Design a protein around this ligand. Sequence first.
Ligand SMILES: O=c1[nH]c(=O)c2nn[nH]c2[nH]1
Ligand SMILES: O=c1[nH]c(=O)c2nn[nH]c2[nH]1
Ligand SMILES: O=c1[nH]c(=O)c2nn[nH]c2[nH]1
Ligand SMILES: O=c1[nH]c(=O)c2nn[nH]c2[nH]1
Ligand code: NA
Ligand code: NA
Ligand code: NA
Ligand code: NA
Lengths: 303, 303, 303, 303
Amino acid sequence: VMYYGKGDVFAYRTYLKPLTGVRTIPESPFSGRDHILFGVNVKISVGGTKLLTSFTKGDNSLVVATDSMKNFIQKHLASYTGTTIEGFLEYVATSFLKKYSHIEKISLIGEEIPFETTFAVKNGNRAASELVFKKSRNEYATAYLNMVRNEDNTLNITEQQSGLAGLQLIKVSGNSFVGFIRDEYTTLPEDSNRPLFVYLNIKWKYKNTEDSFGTNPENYVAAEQIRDIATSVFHETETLSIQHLIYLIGRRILERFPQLQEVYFESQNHTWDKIVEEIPESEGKVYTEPRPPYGFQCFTVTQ
Amino acid sequence: VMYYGKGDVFAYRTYLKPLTGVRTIPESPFSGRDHILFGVNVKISVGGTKLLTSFTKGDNSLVVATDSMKNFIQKHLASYTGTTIEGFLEYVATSFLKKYSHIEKISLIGEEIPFETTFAVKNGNRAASELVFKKSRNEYATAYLNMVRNEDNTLNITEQQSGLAGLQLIKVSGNSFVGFIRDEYTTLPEDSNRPLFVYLNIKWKYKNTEDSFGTNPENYVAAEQIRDIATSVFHETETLSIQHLIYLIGRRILERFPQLQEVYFESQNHTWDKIVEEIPESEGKVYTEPRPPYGFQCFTVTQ
Amino acid sequence: VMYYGKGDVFAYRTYLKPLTGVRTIPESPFSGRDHILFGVNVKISVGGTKLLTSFTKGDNSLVVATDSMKNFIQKHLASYTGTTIEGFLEYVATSFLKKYSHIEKISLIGEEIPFETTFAVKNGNRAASELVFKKSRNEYATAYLNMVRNEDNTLNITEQQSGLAGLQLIKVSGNSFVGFIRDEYTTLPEDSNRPLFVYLNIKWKYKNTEDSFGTNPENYVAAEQIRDIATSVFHETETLSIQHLIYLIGRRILERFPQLQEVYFESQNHTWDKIVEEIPESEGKVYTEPRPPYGFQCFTVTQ
Amino acid sequence: VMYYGKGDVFAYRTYLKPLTGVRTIPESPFSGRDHILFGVNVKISVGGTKLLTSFTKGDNSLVVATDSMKNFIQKHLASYTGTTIEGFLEYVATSFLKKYSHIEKISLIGEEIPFETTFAVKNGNRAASELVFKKSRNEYATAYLNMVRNEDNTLNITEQQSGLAGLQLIKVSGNSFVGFIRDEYTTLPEDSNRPLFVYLNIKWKYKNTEDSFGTNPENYVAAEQIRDIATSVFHETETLSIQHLIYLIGRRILERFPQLQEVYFESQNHTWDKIVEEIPESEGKVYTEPRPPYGFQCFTVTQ
Ligand SMILES: O=c1[nH]c(=O)c2nn[nH]c2[nH]1
Ligand SMILES: O=c1[nH]c(=O)c2nn[nH]c2[nH]1
Ligand SMILES: O=c1[nH]c(=O)c2nn[nH]c2[nH]1
Ligand SMILES: O=c1[nH]c(=O)c2nn[nH]c2[nH]1
Ligand code: NA
Ligand code: NA
Ligand code: NA
Ligand code: NA
């Protein structure tokens, strides 16, 4: 391994070009983003054989300073004329390789810094404010891009992936976990009706990298739509395990978005411990936080 | 000082009695809570002169185990027939003092663990799910209660306060900070149009402690309504400082809720640093995260 | 309430005047501080009735920008000629009130950012490095100071407190918790031998605030020495509860430092849960992390 | 991709067999581990093609509950008779594959939960306590192991890696960063003397995986010794960049441990920003925390 870069490059852009005309799906109202506020956290990694002596000899002649990579990213957010993080990453990568011929490979991660609308009273009625936004610490879109310079000096995207991170969903009933191995190590009771609490990170790849950019919004798959599919499928399914749930979410995603090649899931189980089983005159129960250990699952569904 | 207790007592109740009929205000749509899921994190502190020898002699005869205080709280969430955290705290406190006559004082903090609705497709259209909820890491309601046992054996609430915590609001324009002291220590440039980013913790006290419980919802002041007032006032105001903004929010709150005695604010400034001042063919700018130091303000408005 | 200020003012100073000339105690080999590297995180709060219209009218005429407060603190660390955080706070507080005649009250907190010694081979042997330090995320010293301006423009310290924060100690045997109340809320078993894990925050006040500054260092009480008393007493004591332990720690502190007036403790119980009790041919056991709820105690011992 | 498992399996063991018989190096006085207290946080991942229908059909017949994986790990810490985390992972992995014939692959990570010695006065003198330990939040050792079942039911280790995580080192002088690219993206000044602050994650692989287990301890490479090389080389080197430094650290590690095949570094730059350059009658300066963006480097040195 030999690479170096800059992490936690925050950049907030006001009035990016709006994303509009995204083909809708029945699980989600999403059709686009106004982009009054567009926040992203970028990580940049660059490699190349010509970086060797920066390590072996302490020679900085071909070191682009990591601080300069941060300026590069923030200046390029100001000049980006597109409408998605995925497209922003391509713009940065192509511009960076064009600028710095001694770099053979660039890898970029962009994470949305999300904001939500708020209520303001305008002319006697509540409406979404065009000025005041709430910083959200819940789920967020992500994007990843790797680009290389070939021997013939052409540039090529070697990997692209979009995602949704930080989704935390609890379904209060309609979930079982039964029928698992019972042996000397098993103490977990079977549960016919648990309040399944799952953390979800979902990532997708497109058949055609072009479609990730949003230049034609009809082919763009938004993280918002993925979120809404996940909640709808969770609601619809009498789940039999997290494994069973995530497979079904992936199938739905790939049915709705035929331009996608695959969907990958990283899920964790955070289901609460039950404290009170029966409350007189109620269907209610009481639960509490479990001990730290958490189950997890990782799975790819392909088209 | 002499007290002891239990912190991080999480308790999640399904199907609490709904809060309904809360008097609405024009800044907020809020009228109540369905309470399909009711999550709270409680902290309990108890004191009393009879606890001395637990410290000075290691005598545990009059020590209610902190673990037992946790069972007490979680069992009482199962039996609570009310509709608010404030009322839940009163129920716990009155029951605890009634049970344990050697305790002279109880102090309780309850923090909402908030959940948001999600979309599910039912009968061909998206609707809010009654089953699947999103755990939110954004703003949340809070409540605080202190209760004592008097010499004549009556119980009395000595302090009550409700609040909203973790609100993070950014207004992209319509904010100035000018006219402050310029001397040998001043390097901050005056800014006629900054994207003010404020964190807000707002706390209120009622003229009549009865009104905090929600038993008569007409007199209950919900944290949701406070949030919506704060966003509306922020939108409406060409702010001149955070100080100026929070005073105006407090005035509005006290105008809308005449049953309130006071509102207290803890605000912090997290405004981003500007990177790109002018973008050709756009009203947009680029910003980034500042260095760690943050300004803060603390202020009470009274009725 | 009315005040404002700046939080997370980090400041790192090299080659502060060393602390030497301290008075030793049996429980601690502490003999001073080299101060090659001196890091502090400072919070400053200021108030005064002349600040009202900064809130009520948006008038910034008498507002010292919080950014300027940060500059003030950082510049004063560069000129500070003393040897303790407590002295640094006094230097800042007196300087700030002399500069700003309309401020009536200043409150400061300083928290040490601790570093540990590392070792290097040079000149034929391994020895403590004068250049390379390890940043520590464990316990650290604290200081608190409040100063006011009187009507005659004299300045008075109105409260001072020193402390030790973030100490996490586990004693593997020699601790009991038995004899507590057993009623309908009690499910905790009696334990004649538990591996008590406590978090300790210890704060002390001096009879004469001058002794806190280090100008006559033989009268200074160092956080390092408090730490060493705490670990020694924990070892020496067959503990009957955390309450029992902290009283005995406080007694020893007050015996060793007759110039202190009191010592205040905030303790938390983080004891692990037992998994395996009997290991063949071993005195070992296996434990794991508990659920989140934690007991706590708050207790003052006075001289 | 298809696998599932359990994360944050904390396990604390008292009186593990001590590690002794280690081979020393000039840079480190490390001579073994007492193992009065041995804490580990374990992540386990399992896969196998027979797990498919647990995802595609909700069939839990071949699902080992993740809760049971936690039990397995904790119980195996109680029976483990070795002396290293690396050996513990091998014990767990071999045991798990022998138990569960339908699992084809297991991946494990163990992270040390470190404790530090404390001292107490007893029997007339101050000495290291055999009972009281300080939980440390600084650097810690790590281990990684992957094991597979072949068609003939033999088991093979397919990858092993050891490491040191969380090391944070600041060198106050004797570091330069000069000579880097100066173009339209460069605003960073050349610095002939900076207080370089690096975070280091160092990982090593052995030529023969058996040497990782500690069974013949003279061939074991301890994280403590790696830590001490890192601090010594940092002190000894007039650094020209972090890249320069980590190559020299890796060279020294490979020279001191000829049984290693390679050493991999993940470094981060957290160097503070300068505030005050010239202090009267002192060699000191004042620095503060930077904005969030951090440079990083990833680099392998091979034997
Ligand atoms: O959904 C689940 N999958 C699992 O693998 C598991 N193990 N314990 N609980 C579980 N729940
Ligand atoms: O709103 C603000 N109030 C302040 O007191 C301040 N100081 N710097 N910036 C500021 N902004
Ligand atoms: O030391 C203890 N004090 C307590 O009050 C307590 N309660 N549960 N466990 C406890 N341990
Ligand atoms: O050591 C360094 N390496 C780098 O690549 C770098 N970039 N900015 N500062 C730096 N320091
Ligand atoms: Na739609
Ligand atoms: Na209304
Ligand atoms: Na000395
Ligand atoms: Na030894």
